[PDB]
C-alpha cells in the first residue's frame, strides 16, 4: 500500500532500502557504521515504519559517503512511498526529551525540499562517537537531515532547544524527526 | 450544529461570514484584497472549516478597514459557533514550516480574549505584498490576530521562530492559527 | 460668525476650503488622495468644525503637492476664522488612544507659528499607505502639521507616545490635533 | 437612564455590581480584599459613579480570582450602562499626582477593547500590600485594567510617569482611570 | 486497571494519594495549602486523571515539607499506575497560553528520572501567593516538578516561554505538565 | 467669597498679597525683580485670579529672599482662599507650548504639600535672565514651585517635556501651573 524498495549503487556504496509507512516498527539496519545503525533503528521504530536498510560503502575513508548515500536512498524511499500524499495529516512535529537534552522536529510533506537545522551546540561540529568499529562524526547529523529532506522533497526543521551529551543530542534529533514523520504520514480522518 | 452567520455593516465596510467548525475545508473568500483572500482561504482550509467570506470596503483608502472588519466579524462567528464549548479539546497548537520560515500558534478557547504575537522580523512592520490589485501591508498581521482573538474571546499566541520571505512568514502564521484552532475546536473523547 | 472660505490656485493644485469653527462635524473632503481625505474628515469631525475641502492637483507626480497646498489653505482658513481670538480658551490638548497607539497634541493659538513633532517611530519616514487610488507616504504627516501651524500662525506640538501600526499612528495624530483645536477655539466663559 | 446590574457566578466567585454612570459618588464595595475595596471605592467616587460591588470568592487561594471576576463584571456593567454611546465626549484623560507619584490614564470608548499599561516600577511585579485581612499583590494592577477594558470594550491606556510608594502608585492609577472615565462618559454638548 | 494508592507518613507529613490514569477528571485535593490544592486540581483535571489527595503536614513551619511530600507521593503513584508502560504513546507535550503567559511541558515516560525547568522569570524565586490561609512560595514550583519526575522515574521538561503574573505563570506550568502527561499515558493504537 | 490678604514681614522682605480665586485676571505685581513680576503676572492672569503683589526686599544681595518670601506668602494666600475646598474640581493640569518649549503642570489640592519638578534642562541651574534692573537666576524656578506647594499645602508636579530658551522654559512653567490651578480651583458641578 505505502511501500518502496530503493536500490542505489555508486562508486562509493551499495544501498537497499525497504520501507513501509504503515508499519509497526519492524526495523533492521546494517550500514557498517554501528552508531548510524542505532540512529536509523531509532528513526524507523519511533516512526512506526517497517524499515530494512542494508548498506556497504568505503568506510576505510570514513562513514560520510555511506551515511550520505543511505540518507539519500531513505529520502527517495520516503518520497516514493508517500506517492500523491492524498488524505494525510501532512504536518507533524514532536518534542523529544532525552535526560538533559530537548530536541524538536517539525515537518511539512509539501513536495518542496527544505531543511533548517538550529541550536546544535558548537562542540558537535568536531565530536566523534567512537566504539570498537567505524566511528560517527556528529558534524554529519545536519547532512543526514538535509539529504533526507532533499530526496523525500519535504520541509524538515530540526531544533536542539538545549543539551550537553552528543549521543543524547543526536539520538533526540533522530527520534524527533521519526515522531514528526509518524504524525505527518498518518491518514487525516477529515481531508 | 456548530455554525454561525454574521453580518457586519459599518460606514467603511459590509461583511457576511458563514462558518461551520465541523467542515471539510469548503472555503470561498472575496474581500477585494486578494492576498488577504489567500490568507483566509489558507486559514479556512487548514482549520477544516467550511467558510464563506464576502466583504466590500473602502479599499480606495487602503485594505486596513476591510481587513480589520473582516477579522472582527470572523472572530464573532468563531465565538458564536463554539457556543458553550462543552466537550472540546480547548487547547490546540501547530508548527508550520514554510521553506526557511517556522511559525507556531497556540490557542486556549478560554472565553478570555488575549493575543500575544512575537518573533516577526522588524522588516514586516513596513513590508507591502503588492500585485495587480489592492496591496496588503504585513504590519496588519498583528491586527488580524488581535481582532480574531478579541472577538472570538480566546487566547491566541502566534510566534515566528525564524524566517525571511514576508509571504512565507505571513502564510505560515495564518496556517499555524488554522491548525491550532482545528485541534482546539475538535470534540475531546474524554471530557 | 467664525467662518472663512479660502481659494488657493497654484501651478500644481486648485483648493477651496469652507471652514466654520462653531460647527457640528458636517465634513466633506475630496482631495484625490483618499487616505488624506480620511485624515482631514477625522480632523474636521473630531474638531466639531463644519469643513468642506475640494482639491485637485498633480497626483501623477505623487500626493505631496496636493497634500501640502491643502494644509496651507486649511491653515490660512483656521487663522482667518479665528480673527482677533478675543474670549477663547486659547490653549487646548488631547490624548488619543487608538488600539496600541497613544498620541497627544497641545496647541497655543498665539499668532506665533511653531510646530514640534516628536516620537513618531522611524519606520513612518518611509511607510506607504496604499489602496486602489493615489497612495499616502506617512513621511508627509510632519509636513501637514508644519503647514497647518505656519499658516494658522499657531503653536502646534504633536507627540506619539508609542505605537506600531502606521494607520493608527497617523489617525491618532490627526484626531489629537482635532480635539486640541476644538478645546482651544471654544469660548472661555471667564475671559 | 445609564444603569446596569450585573450578576456573575463562577466556580471561584459570586459578584453583584450596580452601576449608574450619572451618579454623585455613592459607593459601597465589599470584595473580601480590603485594599481592593479601597481602590474600587476610589474608582467609583472619582468617576462620580454610583457603584455597589458585593463579591465573595476563594480568598483562601489568594485575591486573584475575586479581583479578576470583579473587574470582568465591572467592565461588563460599564459597557452595558454606556449602551449606544450616542452624544458622549468619548475621549477622557486625567493626571493624578499622589505625593511623589504621577499617574495618567487616557480612554477612548471605541467598542474596541485595548489596554496598554506602562511605566509601573519593576518592584510592583512582586510587591504585597498586607494588613490584618487578605493581602493585595500589586502585580494584579495590570490584570484589573486589562479585565476592565476587555469587558467594557474600550481603549484604556494607563501610565506611571514616576513614583516610589506602591500604595501611591496603585491608588494614583485607579484614580486616573476614574477621572478619565468621568470625562469620557459625560454628555458632549456639541455632538 | 491503571490505579495506585500511595500512603506516605513522615515526621513532617501524612499523605494519601488515589490515582487512576484512565479517569474523567474526578479530582479532590486537600493539602492545607489552598493555592497548591488549586494547582494539583488543575493538574488532575487537565490530565483526565481521577485523583484524590489528602495531606496534613507541618504548615506552622511553611508549606514546603507538605508540598514536597505530596509531590513525592504523587510521583510514586504515577510510576506505580504506569506499571510496565506497554502500548502507551510514551511522549507527550502541551503548550498552555494563560493570558500573557505561554508555558510548555514535554515528557518521556523513559524510567530515567530527569527534570529540566527553564524560562521562569527571576521574580518567581522570591514571590509569595498569599490568601487567608497558608501561603505558597513560587520558588517551590521547580521543587514540585523535580519531585514528580524523580519519583515517577520520567523525563519532564517544563518551559516558560514568557509571562508576568506569578499565578498565570505557575498555573500554566501545572496545566502544561497535566496535558503532556495525558498525551504520554494514552494507549498508542500502533505499538 | 474666595479671597485672602496675607502680610509677611521678615528681616529680609515685606510682602502684601491680595488674592481672589474667582477673578478675571486683574493682576498687579511689583517685587523689585522685573522678570519675576512678569512671571507672577502670567501666573495671576492665566489662573483667572485677581492678584495684587507688593514686595520690597534685600535685592542688594540678589532676588532670592524676595522671590522666596513672595512665593511663601502667595502659597499661604492660595491655601487660605481655598478654605475647606468643598465642591471644587480638586485636580487640574495644563500643557503650555511656548515656541520650541512644551511644559506641563498637574495639581491635586490635597492638603498634602508635595512638589516634583522634572525635565528642566541642566543649563537653567546656572542661567541668568538680566535686564536693566535686578536679574533673575533660573535656578530659583524650582524654589518658587516648592515654596508655593509647601505653603498652599497642595501637590504640584511641574514638567518640562523639552525646550531651549530659558525665558520660554520658565514662562511656560509658570503658565502651566497657572492653568492647572485654574482648572483645580473651579467649582465641580457634580460634587
Ligand atoms: O528510548 P529507547 O528505548 O528507544 O532508547 C534506548 C536507550 O537506552 C539508549 O538509546 C540510550 C540511552 N542513553 C543514550 N542512549
Ligand atoms: O500549502 P498550500 O498548498 O496550502 O499552499 C500553496 C502554496 O503553493 C502557496 O501558497 C505558496 C508557496 N510559497 C508561497 N505561497
Ligand atoms: O473613531 P472613528 O469612528 O472616527 O474612526 C473609525 C475607525 O473605524 C477607522 O478610522 C479605523 C480603525 N482602525 C483604523 N482606522
Ligand atoms: O484623595 P482621597 O481623599 O480620595 O484619598 C484619601 C487618602 O488619605 C488615602 O487614600 C491615602 C493617602 N496615602 C495613601 N492613601
Ligand atoms: O482554565 P480553568 O477553568 O481550569 O481555570 C479557571 C481560571 O478561571 C482560574 O484558575 C484563573 C484565572 N486566572 C488565574 N486563575
Ligand atoms: O502669551 P502672553 O500674551 O501671556 O505672553 C506675551 C509674550 O509675548 C511674552 O511673554 C513672550 C514671548 N516670548 C517670550 N516672552
Ligand atoms: Cl505626558
Ligand atoms: Cl518551542
Ligand atoms: Mn557529502
Ligand atoms: Mn543510544
Ligand atoms: Mn485598526
Ligand atoms: Mn502563498
Ligand atoms: Mn513640500
Ligand atoms: Mn482609519
Ligand atoms: Mn487571571
Ligand atoms: Mn490609600
Ligand atoms: Mn525540599
Ligand atoms: Mn487560578
Ligand atoms: Mn531659600
Ligand atoms: Mn515673556
Q: What is the DSSP string of D149-161?
A: HHHHT-EEEEEEE
Does residue A159 have its Cβ closer than 6 Å to ligand 1? no
- How far apart CA C168 and CA C156 sit, in angstroms, is 20
Does residue D179 have its Cβ closer than 6 Å to ligand 4? no
Strand segments, DSSP code E, in F69-143 are: 91-98, 101-108, 114-118, 128-129, 136-137
Q: Does D95 touch chain F (CB under 8 A)?
A: yes
Instruction: Give contacts of D64 with chain E, Cβ < 8 Å.
Output: 129, 165, 167
Contact D156 C102 (CB under 8 A): no
Closest chain A CA to residue E150: A99
Contact criterion met (CB below 8 Å) for D156 and D74? no
Residue D11 CB-density burial (10 A; 0-12 exposed, 13-18 middle, 19+ buried): exposed
- DSSP states along E75-136: HHHHHHHHTT-TTB--EEEEEEEETTEEEEEEEE--SS-EEEEE---GGGGS-EE--SSS-E
Q: At what angle do helices E64-82 and E141-152 cross, to 10 degrees?
A: 30
Helices (H), chain B: 34-46, 64-82, 141-152, 166-185
Atom of ligand 2 nearest to the CA of B42: 4
- Which of D44, D97, D167 is the mutation pick for testing F, counting most F CBs within 10 A? D97
Q: What are phi and psi of D130, to 5 degrees?
A: -125, 130
Name residues contacting ligand 2 (CB within 6 A): B 42, 167-168, 171
Contact E35 D62 (CB under 8 A): yes
- How far apart CA A142 and CA A149 sit, in angstroms, is 11
DSSP classification of residue D135: -
- How far apart CA D40 and CA D29 sit, in angstroms, is 7
Domains of chain B, first to last: 1-89 (3.30.230.40), 90-191 (3.30.230.40)
> Could you give the C-alpha distances from D171 to B28, B135, D73, E27, in angstroms and in order?
52, 47, 20, 40
Q: Does A91 touch chain B (CB under 8 A)?
A: yes
Number of DSSP helices (H) and strands (E) in chain E, helices first? 4, 10
Cβ neighbours of C189 (radius 10 Å): 8
Residues 6 or more apart whose Cβ sits within 8 Å of residue F185: F2, F21, F47, F82, F88, F89, F92, F109
Contact criterion met (CB below 8 Å) for D114 and D188? no
Cβ neighbours of A165 (radius 10 Å): 13
- How far apart CA B21 and CA B112 sit, in angstroms, is 20
Contact criterion met (CB below 8 Å) for C24 and C50? yes
Does residue D42 have its Cβ closer than 6 Å to ligand 4? yes
Q: How was this structure determined?
A: X-ray
Cβ neighbours of A64 (radius 10 Å): 17
Q: What are phi and psi of A46, to 5 degrees?
A: -65, -20
Bridge partners for C97 per DSSP: C102
Bridge partners for F53 per DSSP: F17, F29
- How far apart CA A149 and CA C113 sit, in angstroms, is 65
Does residue F37 have its Cβ closer than 6 Å to ligand 6? no
Residues 6 or more apart whose Cβ sits within 8 Å of residue D146: D115, D117, E99
Q: Does D61 touch chain C (CB under 8 A)?
A: no
Does residue D39 have its Cβ closer than 6 Å to ligand 4? no
Shortest CA distance to A39 belongs to which of A106, A96, A1? A96
E155-162 and E114-118: which strand pairing? parallel
Q: Whose CA is nearest to atom 2 of ligand 6?
A: F42
CA distance to partner chain A, nearest, from residue B98 (Å): 7
Could you identify the residue written with the cell 479671597? F3
Contact criterion met (CB below 8 Å) for D170 and D129? yes
Contact criterion met (CB below 8 Å) for E154 and E110? yes
Contact F190 D97 (CB under 8 A): no
B144-175: string of b/e by CB count within 10 Å (b at 16+)? bbbbbbbbbbbbbbbbbbebeebbbbbbbbbb
Contact criterion met (CB below 8 Å) for B57 and B69? yes
Q: Indicate the SS3 state at residue F96.
A: strand
- E138 C-alpha vs ligand 17 centroid, how far in Å? 13
Resolution of the coordinates in A? 1.8
Cβ-nearest to C157 among F48, F102, F179: F102
Atom of ligand 6 nearest to the CA of F38: 10
Amino acid at each position: 500500500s505505502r511501500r518502496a524498495r530503493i536500490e542505489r549503487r555508486t562508486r562509493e556504496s551499495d544501498i537497499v532500502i525497504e520501507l513501509d509507512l504503515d508499519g509497526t516498527g519492524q526495523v533492521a539496519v546494517d550500514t557498517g557504521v554501528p552508531f548510524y545503525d542505532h540512529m536509523l533503528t531509532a528513526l524507523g521504530s519511533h516512526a512506526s515504519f517497517d524499515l530494512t536498510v542494508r548498506a556497504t560503502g568505503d568506510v576505510e575513508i570514513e562513514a560520510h559517503h555511506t551515511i550520505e548515500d543511505t540518507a539519500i536512498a531513505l529520502g527517495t524511499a520516503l518520497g516514493q512511498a508517500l506517492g500523491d500524499k492524498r488524505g494525510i495529516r501532512r504536518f507533524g512535529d514532536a518534542f523529544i526529551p532525552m535526560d538533559e537534552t530537548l530536541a524538536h522536529a517539525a515537518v511539512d510533506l509539501s513536495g518542496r525540499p527544505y531543511c533548517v537545522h538550529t541550536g546544535e551546540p558548537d562542540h558537535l561540529q568536531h565530536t566523534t562517537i567512537a566504539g570498537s568499529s567505524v566511528p560517527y562524526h556528529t558534524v554529519i547529523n545536519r547532512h543526514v537531515f538535509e539529504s533526507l529532506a532533499a530526496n523525500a522533497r519535504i520541509a524538515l526543521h530540526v531544533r536542539v532547544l538545549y543539551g550537553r551529551d552528543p549521543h543524547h543530542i543526536t539520538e533526540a534529533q533522530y527520534k524527533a524527526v521519526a515522531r514528526a514523520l509518524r504524525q505527518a504520514v498518518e491518514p487525516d480522518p477529515r481531508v
